[PDB]
């Protein structure tokens, strides 16, 4: 989908219907570093594994 913003917070939705979600490492993939994309944005990418799993 696309990344959107309601003014303060950043979400990810599908392209044909509004349905925002929290940006994790299961909605995204990673390729490269932040000095070649024209228009990049600082945010936090949540991890769905570390805060629930310790033991």
């Amino acid at each position: 989908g696309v990344f959107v913003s309601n003014g303060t917070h950043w979400f990810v939705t599908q392209r044909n219907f509004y349905e925002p979600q929290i940006i994790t490492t299961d909605n995204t993939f990673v390729s490269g570093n932040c000095d070649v994309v024209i228009g990049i944005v600082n945010n936090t990418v949540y991890d769905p594994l570390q805060p629930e799993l310790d033991s």
């Binding site: 392209r15 390729s31 070649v36």
Partner: protein, 49 residues
């Protein structure tokens, strides 16, 4: 935006969308030269119509 539309159009042919964002100026240069070559090879007497 136009670059996001072109990045979504690279997904239709089976290339991931980081290939556009990492090569954006090269792609824009190739497009701007191909339009000029169309204009050149039409402006001369090559009657393709």
């Amino acid at each position: 935006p136009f670059a996001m539309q072109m990045a979504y159009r690279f997904n239709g042919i089976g290339v991931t969308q980081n290939v556009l964002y990492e090569n954006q100026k090269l792609i824009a240069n190739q497009f701007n030269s191909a339009i000029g070559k169309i204009q050149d090879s039409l402006s001369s007497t090559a009657s393709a119509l």
